[PDB]
Amino acid sequence: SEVLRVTHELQAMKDKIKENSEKIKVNKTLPY
Amino acid sequence: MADPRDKALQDYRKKLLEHKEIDGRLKELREQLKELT
Amino acid sequence: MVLESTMVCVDNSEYMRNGDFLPTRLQAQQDAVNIVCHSKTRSNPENNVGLITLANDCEVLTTLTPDTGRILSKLHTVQPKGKITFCTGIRVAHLALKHRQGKNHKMRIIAFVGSPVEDNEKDLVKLAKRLKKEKVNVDIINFGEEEVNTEKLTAFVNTLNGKDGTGSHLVTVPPGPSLADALISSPIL
Amino acid sequence: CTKIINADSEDPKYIINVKQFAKFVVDLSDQVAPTDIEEGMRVGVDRN
């Protein structure tokens, strides 16, 4: 019901946002 | 009729507590997934 | 273990809003789901699942996937409004199945025939005359509305078999709003 | 050659001013312990 739409349905930011921050971090090259 | 609306009142209170827990879950998640989005 | 994929034809008809098995009917199509296939992956974690609607000529809401979150999420929004469609609905699922990966997986269509259909008499020529040469499997679930036993729909499995087939069975759970145990226990699958 | 104008404590990042080219933010190579490198000393920054 409400939760199943939120337990893993939705709440996917815990995977997508995790990955997305991975690439923004990886692109933090050493030089500045 | 034996119970003077005491055990039944406690059971109704437990049902209302479960309903309140559901309402709190709704309130928390409606904002948590909002923040994640 | 599982030599099969899974596609489902979740009804969406205008008649789907009715108290006949529970709250508002469809609320029960959703019911098995969480077991409508939850049981199917209760199998080796390599099964595949799908979803197909059947109103307004029917769209597709899920592409074969060993995932269930998507199918549940789409199920949440399946508002019933429109006349049921078939034949075409089944052929869309057939094509989708053909585009299945892991050729080892066999095919299966679980038809939640709820609201009445408009199919003619000799629909068999396209409904079943293929599944043999295509070695396909189709399952029929009659969400009530069993008009005169819906021999028209029963004839689909009738065309099935011919010696052996029928899949599990064309189980028409009684209009008694008991539950989905009838779609949970009854299905030995 | 290049000098160091800061060494972020507990943060491995350093800031250096080479000489005439420009400033930059640099990472400390594994071969050199951070303690051996201080503020104001001359570091052997590499190219690339």
How would you write A1-32 as a 3-class SS string? CCCHHHHCCCCCHHHHHHHHHHHHHHCCCCCC
Q: Is A5 on the interface with C (CB under 8 A)?
A: yes
Q: Give the residue numbers in A contacting B (CB under 8 Å), as ranges.
A: 2-3, 6, 10-11, 13-14, 17
Give the tokens for residue C116: 């009445």
Segments in chain C forming alpha helices (H): 29-32, 38-41, 69-76, 88-98, 124-127, 151-159, 181-184
Chains contacting B (3 or more CB pairs within 8 Å): A
> Phi and psi for C109 in degrees, rounded to 5?
-125, 120
Please judge whether A17 and B36 are an interchain contact, meaning their C-beta atoms are less than 8 angstroms apart: yes
Cross-strand bridge partners of residue C49: C65
Write out the two tokens for B26. Answer: 């709704």
Q: Does A30 touch chain D (CB under 8 A)?
A: yes
Q: How far B34 CA sits from the closest chain A CA (Å)?
A: 9
Interface partners of A (3+ CB pairs, < 8 Å)?
B, C, D
Environment class of D24 (CB within 10 Å of its CB; exposed 0-12, middle 13-18, buried 19+) = middle
Q: How far apart are CA C132 and CA D26, in angstroms?
A: 69
Query: Phi, psi at residue C167, to the nearest 5°?
Result: 55, -140
Give dist(CA C67, CA C65) in Å, integer: 5
CB contact under 8 A, A2 and B33: no
Query: Residues with Cβ < 8 Å from C151, sequence gap 6 or more?
Result: none
Q: In Å, how far are A7, A22, B11, B22 from B17, measured between CA atoms? A: 21, 41, 10, 9
Domain ranges of chain C: 3-186
C-alpha distances (whole Å) from D39 to each of C39, C51, C63, D2 are 65, 64, 59, 12
Cα D29 to Cα C169: distance, rounded to the nearest angstrom:
69
Indicate the Cα dihedral angle C101, C55, C124, C140, nearest 10°. Answer: 70
Token pair 């250096």 in the structure block, residue? D16
Structural contact between residues C139 and C170, judged by C-beta atoms closer than 8 angstroms: yes
Neighbors of chain D with 3 or more C-beta pairs under 8 Å: A
Chain A hits for D26, CB-CB cut-off 8 Å, are 30-31
Asked if C75 and C33 count as a contact pair (C-beta separation under 8 A), the reply is: yes
> H/E/C letters for each residue in chain B?
CCCCCCHHHHHHHHHHHHHHHHHHHHHHHHHHHHHHC
* Interface residue C45 vs chain A (CB under 8 A): no
Alpha carbon dihedral C122, C55, C186, C145, in 10-degree steps, equals -70
Say if CB D41 and CB D16 are below 8 A apart: no
Q: What is the rounded distance in angstroms from the CA atom of residue B26 to the CA atom of residue B28?
A: 6
d(CA C18, CA C24): 5
Tell me the two tokens of residue D38: 């201080």
Structure resolution, Å: 3.8
Chain B environment of A1 (Cβ under 8 Å): none
CA distance C13 to C128: 23
CB of A31 within 8 Å of a chain D CB? The answer is yes
Q: Which residues of C38-55 are buried (b: 16+ CB within 10 A; e: fewer)?
A: eebbeeeeebbbbbbbbb
The H or E element spanning position C185 is none
Residue from B18, C33, C38, C72 nearest A7 by CA: C72
Rounded Cα distance, A29 and D25, in Å: 10
With an 8 Å Cβ cutoff, are C34 and A8 in contact? no
Rounded to whole angstroms, the Cα distance separating B20 from A23 reads 41
- For residue C73, list chain A residues with Cβ-Cβ distance below 8 A: 5, 9-10
